[PDB]
């Protein structure tokens, strides 16, 4: 199942960068969406590792 294209990598990397910044800011909604778009291109333990979909609400 498929070679990673540079286009895919670029999208993957921008998504992770922005998901991290979103997490720093506290917008977990955006982080969750972005980490998932990353997972859809290139799934891996570190990304799936959020999750950390914690709430108490």
């Amino acid at each position: 199942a498929e070679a990673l294209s540079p286009e895919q990598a670029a999208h993957y990397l921008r998504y992770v960068k922005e998901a991290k910044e979103a997490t720093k800011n506290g917008d977990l909604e955006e982080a969750f969406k972005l980490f998932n778009l990353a997972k859809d291109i290139f799934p891996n333990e570190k990304v799936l590792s959020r999750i950390q979909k914690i709430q108490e609400a």
Partner: protein, 97 residues
């Protein structure tokens, strides 16, 4: 012979993490490019495909493609693919604007 070499913690993958990347990899060369992306995302933000970086990738690749221990195999399959992946990524970025 000489020592135990380990990479820095930030570039250390678990066997589980390595297996997963391999399972998605179409070839030795694709594995090498996926590894570049996972280990060295700093190389894609605002070249430094330098020897230490490439050797680290090759060490991981060799776990599942042991013929890559032959430098000819490395230079025939993986290394042109890594460089062309990296060139393509940067030209694509240059062109965005």
């Amino acid at each position: 012979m000489v020592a135990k070499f380990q990479p820095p913690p930030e570039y250390q993958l678990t066997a589980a993490e390595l297996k997963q990347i391999v399972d998605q990899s179409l070839s030795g060369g694709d594995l090498a490019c996926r590894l570049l992306v996972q280990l060295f995302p700093e190389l894609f933000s605002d070249r430094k495909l330098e020897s230490l970086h490439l050797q680290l990738i090759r060490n991981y690749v060799e776990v599942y493609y042991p013929s890559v221990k032959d430098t000819a195999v490395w230079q025939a399959e993986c290394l042109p693919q890594l460089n062309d992946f990296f060139s393509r990524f940067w030209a694509q970025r240059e062109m965005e604007d």
